[PDB]
Amino acid sequence: YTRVVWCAVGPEEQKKCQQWSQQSGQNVTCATASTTDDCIVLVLKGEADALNLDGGYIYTAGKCGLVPVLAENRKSSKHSSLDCVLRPTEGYLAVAVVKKANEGLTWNSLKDKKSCHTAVDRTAGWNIPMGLIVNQTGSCAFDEFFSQSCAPGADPKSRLCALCAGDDQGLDKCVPNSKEKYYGYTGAFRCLAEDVGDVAFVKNDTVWENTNGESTADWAKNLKREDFRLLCLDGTRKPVTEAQSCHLAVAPNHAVVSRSDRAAHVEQVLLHQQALFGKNGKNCPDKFCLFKSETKNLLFNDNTECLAKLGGRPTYEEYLGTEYVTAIANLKKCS
């Protein structure tokens, strides 16, 4: 009854979760759905217990009564005394990234260009840049701004999915899961690296982790950081070292959500599971690492050091922050 049912989004996450379930001696077991929204429905129905979510998905889940349990914490700079599990999270930087060779593309000349998004409804990929664009254009027709896009989750016949590529067989175009070649932070950055799009909306860490040999994956292995620039809201372009002064927003960290009635038990099982399979886990890398997936960010971001306790038993609006919840609410007025 202490068994926790994780929800895997698509078949790559399902494989990873089945490995975790075998290694955990079924203390964790797996349900799978094709999209994050479908996993949120399985948790609402009580057919799964928990999954990790981007902050835009935490807004969907929290409007439905699910609660944040633990947050991803990556490597920090201040508070190094404090154990990872007890350290306040820092947010991550939402950025707009372009190629250096695409000279004279700036924030102010994005109209009619090609865009790459992590997925509809996600923080850096969609809520932050589209919220900003709707506000600045004074128009809700955000499906007409870029000439073509990959925005997984949108209608596959629309311009918002025109650049999406589907799976190895070219099926599942635009699905919001890792089967879509251009899904998520890594897929939207690959869409820009391959010059399918002109801009990608990702986070600062994705640029660094997929350049300069930080990834050995085939499409990333030869990318150089200096070949990219960030688009700043004042119309300037900066090197990717300057994200602290050239971002679109600071996003709340991805976090595990559950029904309120199972939160305490999900929390206790995850704190034990990361002791085993987390960053310096007893059985990681020997048997299984919960926070690696060959850069694919399956079930958790690969840069995750631990899942950390939340201060103040926060509601989902307190965890997201009032600035971000208000930004989302305004954007969702459009559709």
């Binding site: 929204d37 949120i40 429905v41 609402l44 969907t60 409007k63 439905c64 009564g65 609410a329």
Partner: peptide
């Protein structure tokens, strides 16, 4: 403001 999407 107020409704779960499902």
């Amino acid at each position: 403001l107020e409704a779960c999407a499902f």
